[PDB]
Amino acid sequence: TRLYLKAEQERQHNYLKDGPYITAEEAVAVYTTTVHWLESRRFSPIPFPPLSYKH
Amino acid sequence: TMPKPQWHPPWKLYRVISGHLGWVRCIAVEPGNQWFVTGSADRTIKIWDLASGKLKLSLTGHISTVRGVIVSTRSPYLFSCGEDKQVKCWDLEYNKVIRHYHGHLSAVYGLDLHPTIDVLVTCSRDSTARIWDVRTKASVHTLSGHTNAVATVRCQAAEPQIITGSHDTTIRLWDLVAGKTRVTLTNHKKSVRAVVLHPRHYTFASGSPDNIKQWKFPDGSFIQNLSGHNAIINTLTVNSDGVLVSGADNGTMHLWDWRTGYNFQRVHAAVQPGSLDSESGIFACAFDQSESRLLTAEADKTIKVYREDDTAT
């Protein structure tokens, strides 16, 4: 447990120092692709649960 | 000086061997330049091919840090001693322990073999040193004397057979058959960690954090004082060529002209790839049988081999 949490704290600190590894253009590619998928799938967003909800 | 005395060639680092997981505390070399052995905090004893530097054989059996290692000349044995308390005799014919010498009350820091008699001499934190009959595993003598831990012990054939030093800063010379002290030297101000006997001259040297003293035999008349390099110094070792090497806890190593105290070279060596700067310094070091290679045991968990530079002048 102690070792694992150490290397953990290491990886967090290295993720803050070294910045996001996903770069940028890649991330845009992901977001865009997902957008196209949900588009062709007619998926309507899930709204917030209303105060009156019978279920 | 006598006249800008004895020109010796510088040494260079030749090879670095990794492969201990703990600090290497001890190096010994086999009588035929075939294999050299190392004791470690890893709790192993490893035997390494002198030539290629490949690891031949890992032994396991000590419970704690192995501190001291000797390869007998006249019999196919290792002796090793540890922080455990245990001094073991390995029969290298089978790679197993055949005897164990029992009786020190604390960690055993050091050990050595009489060159002709067949008796083993050990130093311990418990402030004693023992003379052990190798054959019967018997405390021939117990050398009471120093007030702190005995650190380094050397054994010789002639007069004062046993030369020993301790952290209480005083050297006693022990008359083997009596098991009593002939000479007490008190000229170091801080702990004596290392001593060494000169192959031909009939003299001996001792090292302390403060400085390094040579001695006449017997009875230790003062002779010289080599001053220079100030660290807690763990190793003194000498070639037949009159080359005296001083290791140290801060990593530093210095080469000396035995005769004059001319310190021709200073070697400060890089710590290993990982590591930390603080884990530097050589616990111990030795010379192959040909006097052509200097081996060092380091806290960065390596073995370094130094080779005398052939272009030199």
Binding site: L3 | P31, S52, E93, I98, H102, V271, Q272, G274, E291
Partner: protein, 96 residues
């Protein structure tokens, strides 16, 4: 004042001393030997030995795995217990 007490450990064992023999490497041989020559030639031999030895029309990404040749991380030995590659592997293996 020596006690008549005994112990198992203490009893005789290996009462004979194995002296080194001539082919094992008796001191006689050692004294005569020129080690330096032997050490050099062995070294040379070792060196020689070493020498002898040596569609998808649609995707997010062009090849990531271009020049990624492993790297010498497992050749580096590190004297630091938490940043040794051994430790990384251990940590990787046993935690989820």
């Amino acid at each position: 004042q020596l006690s008549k007490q005994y112990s198992s450990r203490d009893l005789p064992s290996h009462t004979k001393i194995k002296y080194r023999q001539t082919t094992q490497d008796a001191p006689e041989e050692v004294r005569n030997r020129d080690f330096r020559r032997e050490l050099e030639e062995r070294e040379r031999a070792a060196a020689r030995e070493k020498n002898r030895d040596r569609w998808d029309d649609d995707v997010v990404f062009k090849n990531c795995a271009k020049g990624v040749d492993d790297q010498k991380k497992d050749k580096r030995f590190v004297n630091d217990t938490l940043r040794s590659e051994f430790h990384k592997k251990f940590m990787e293996k046993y935690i989820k």
